Amino acid sequence: ITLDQSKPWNRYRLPTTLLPDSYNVTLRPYLTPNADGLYIFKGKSIVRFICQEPTDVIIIHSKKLNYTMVVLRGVGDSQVPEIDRTELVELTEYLVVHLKGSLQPGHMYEMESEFQGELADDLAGFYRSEYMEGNVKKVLATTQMQSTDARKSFPCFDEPAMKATFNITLIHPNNLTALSNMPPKGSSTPLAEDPNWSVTEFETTPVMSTYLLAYIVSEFQSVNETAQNGVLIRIWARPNAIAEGHGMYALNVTGPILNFFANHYNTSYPLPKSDQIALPDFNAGAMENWGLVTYRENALLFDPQSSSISNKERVVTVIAHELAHQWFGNLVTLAWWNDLWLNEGFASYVEYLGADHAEPTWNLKDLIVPGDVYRVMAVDALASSHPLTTPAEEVNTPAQISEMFDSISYSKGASVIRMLSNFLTEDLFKEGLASYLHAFAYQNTTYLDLWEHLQKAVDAQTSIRLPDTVRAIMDRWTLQMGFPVITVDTKTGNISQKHFLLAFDYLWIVPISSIKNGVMQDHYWLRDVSQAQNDLFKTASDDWVLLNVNVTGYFQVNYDEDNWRMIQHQLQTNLSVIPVINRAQVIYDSFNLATAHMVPVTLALDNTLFLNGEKEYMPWQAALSSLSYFSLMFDRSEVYGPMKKYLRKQVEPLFQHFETLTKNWTERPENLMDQYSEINAISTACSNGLPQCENLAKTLFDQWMSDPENNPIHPNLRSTIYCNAIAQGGQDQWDFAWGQLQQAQLVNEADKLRSALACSNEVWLLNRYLGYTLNPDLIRKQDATSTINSIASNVIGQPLAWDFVQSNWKKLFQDYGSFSFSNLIQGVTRRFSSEFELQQLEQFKKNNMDVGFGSGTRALEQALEKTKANIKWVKENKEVVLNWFIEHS
Ligand SMILES: *[C@@H]1O[C@H](CO)[C@@H](O)[C@H](O)[C@H]1NC(C)=O
Ligand SMILES: *[C@@H]1O[C@H](CO)[C@@H](O)[C@H](O)[C@H]1NC(C)=O
Ligand SMILES: *[C@@H]1O[C@H](CO)[C@@H](O)[C@H](O)[C@H]1NC(C)=O
Ligand SMILES: *[C@@H]1O[C@H](CO)[C@@H](O)[C@H](O)[C@H]1NC(C)=O
Ligand SMILES: *[C@@H]1O[C@H](CO)[C@@H](O)[C@H](O)[C@H]1NC(C)=O
Ligand SMILES: *[C@@H]1O[C@H](CO)[C@@H](O)[C@H](O)[C@H]1NC(C)=O
Ligand SMILES: *[C@@H]1O[C@H](CO)[C@@H](O)[C@H](O)[C@H]1NC(C)=O
Ligand SMILES: *[C@@H]1O[C@H](CO)[C@@H](O)[C@H](O)[C@H]1NC(C)=O
Ligand SMILES: *[C@@H]1O[C@H](CO)[C@@H](O)[C@H](O)[C@H]1NC(C)=O
Ligand SMILES: [Zn+2]
């Protein structure tokens, strides 16, 4: 359905003729439904804007708002044109006011409107969340504006670069607390018409993007602390959660992290307070609204009793991430969404800095490697991938904007920034960044503003030298999709680079670390050249070399056979000579190379042989997610049996190691890494049928059922023990776990049960479960997508979920963009390896082509591309893979 752009109201980007100065917004949520089912809110809003250039039309964003139509006033006296007519243009989400005369440049105007909207179970705009306290049902009102939902709350020019000051008022019941970005201005006052309602006015915001606005009406309480910089910190949640002390851990790390960031970047946090609030219904993990940060309960709340170590790492990490946005993205904002990584890439990298400071003994910084680097490479190796910075004119529609919210902007951004930091030295990097923040505070930026400030810092200094300007290096990482594979011929010292695939010509300037028989060598820079030679990369005799120590650069390395064998021999002899992270890398890169058909698949499998004597977290993690792909390809085939037998063989000694160290699973390992390694160990043993593990799970889960009130199972072990107990059992185990889920007060516990229920081997149980997935009384809309994905991951659940998604698609499309919908498509299609399944996917697309795929559109394309690649890969490799596992088991 095309629009003719001759009309500016048919265009997706706002005109540049009018700029907002400030807003007054008054909102009134009605927390009881009217006389059918409907919860609504009422609003009144006034925008003050300046006319930059003459125009006879006023165009602002408005979505799903009903008007009760508008009033235009000149500031003081500028005479003002009369209003001719006023219309809503739905597709493009505009309220359009046609004038009988033109506004004049330099003049200011105020436009006033009253409206009404649904407080939907939407999770977008102004919406309702619900929960239980005792036997009473509670409703609260909350916001999610990013990326373009502000317009769903009140009329505004809803684009990130048009920054304004906001004066917010909330009209709410006497006994409910009203929160916003700023603290309250003075006291609440009774509503004139109805003294049971109160009017709460908030202090003016600093100059700010609309997508950062937040307002909340609830019965929540807080615990509070002042941070070292004088900023007031509060943690808000459900009264029972606060009282049970679930907000304490968040209170411990928040101020310290906020203060760390202010010092590290030499930029003070400008607001008087920063509120953190845990919401029962929320779409993403967390949202960075300036002064009031919103989280899912599982990203904020922590119970040291029933919460996992993973849950705990998730809390500091999400908090750090959200605080980082106070600087990157709030104080300084991207000019437009094609640049999303200037916000998200930065927060994704600095989250690790912040989290490391709050938890210095964890060694978090390493998690960025499996957690960001190798996660995104799988996707960034597609021809359908996109560069960090896409061209502005290619991002227009709301769905295209939501699509920018993918792993490229987050994880590749973080990766590439970690590389930049590493070759600059964070000390130098942070100076450049402080200069960029101070220069651009309360304004917007493009990637070019970033480089120029980094360049300035480099220029002012001597010790660090670059082969080129920061821009020449970074433009190649920023403006072209993908990453190079770097190939080393170890006999001659030839080194080359090639775009890794399943205007700069796909050449990068690549910083290269190396290690020779375990000792550091001089750093090296590969310029943008397809090949070069250096004696750093030449080995003699039995020596070996490894490139990209600690996987600091974003790229993968392939060697000649003989070096590979040397590495392998080293892993058998003393694996400690190789840095633990690079041990993981030899695995990730092996498998990725085998996947892309650039090395025989037996190389990857052979690199798996030493895991025999590996107790460290990361190399196992590398194997697990690498083989995860084989699992997706082969778990329906004859490869599967031998493959499981092999993993049992490899995993067993690690499992025994932990049994002993852990004293019959009574004591938990000391450090985080080792705890992670124990969790992977048990998980792998059970998934693969280690009898000792399956016995453990059955015994423990059985003990739990006979005494529901005391759960015998340590939280770290729960995901694995629940899953396997349910897998081995039947309706009794399932109904028990379901009863636990329905009454569960801790979200972490609920999440573990939700995934475990998806492990049943009975088709009828899984299909019934899918049914529950669409009932909001049973599964909250925010959990529906991940629940369906859990079921799809079950090999027996695969066809159930695929059929369910196809037949429920219309329904699923209206409700459940922002990242879940795309995850649904990706999750159900991961296994398609055959032409028949490919045709199936094509048919699905064709059948639904009318009502589109929305924010999942690009996900569907990548699903198709990958499927095609799987078919070719699976036919080529299955004989070899099968034979290999047979021999080695
Ligand atoms: C909001 O409040 C500030 C401070 O009182 C004021 O200067 C600004 O003009 C107000 N915005 C309006 C009235 O749109
Ligand atoms: C916005 O709010 C402030 C506080 O009530 C007020 O001073 C100002 O007049 C309002 N702006 C209008 C009515 O345009
Ligand atoms: C918006 O108006 C439409 C049609 O007039 C109506 O269906 C809906 O109830 C309204 N939403 C409100 C009043 O919140
Ligand atoms: C607020 O008042 C309402 C209506 O009586 C009540 O349902 C709710 O429990 C109250 N919340 C409080 C007192 O925190
Ligand atoms: C919160 O901080 C206090 C002081 O360090 C501590 O007693 C408590 O263990 C912390 N809660 C955690 C780490 O979950
Ligand atoms: C710190 O920021 C101040 C300006 O607020 C500036 O004077 C100084 O150069 C900055 N120093 C560093 C090391 O970033
Ligand atoms: C975006 O930022 C630039 C400075 O980088 C500023 O001059 C411009 O006014 C900003 N755009 C808007 C709409 O404010
Ligand atoms: C690589 O990482 C380890 C920790 O995993 C660290 O101790 C070592 O110093 C790092 N090596 C380099 C060259 O940064
Ligand atoms: C393994 O190599 C490391 C040095 O990387 C050394 O500390 C250790 O002693 C070696 N182990 C043996 C058995 O030689
Ligand atoms: Zn973010």
Residue numbers in the entry: 59 to 126, 131 to 564, 575 to 888, 891 to 963
Sentences from the paper on this structure:
We determined several crystal structures of dimeric human and porcine APN (hAPN and pAPN) ectodomains, which reveal the dynamic conformation of this protein. Each crystal captured a single APN conformation, with all the monomers in the same form. These structures identified three distinct APN conformations, based on active site accessibility, which we termed closed, intermediate and open forms.
The phenylalanine adopted a distinct conformation in the intermediate and open APN conformations. These changes would facilitate release of the N-terminal residue after hydrolysis. The porcine CoV spike RBD binds to a pAPN region that is distant from the catalytic site. A critical CoV receptor-binding motif, which bears an exposed tryptophan, penetrates a narrow cavity formed by domain II and IV. The structure of the pAPN-RBD complex indicates that porcine CoV would be specific for the open conformation. The receptor-binding domain (RBD) of a porcine CoV bound specifically to the open pAPN form and inhibited catalysis, probably by preventing APN dynamics and closure. The RBD can thus prevent catalysis in only a fraction of pAPN molecules, probably those in the open form.
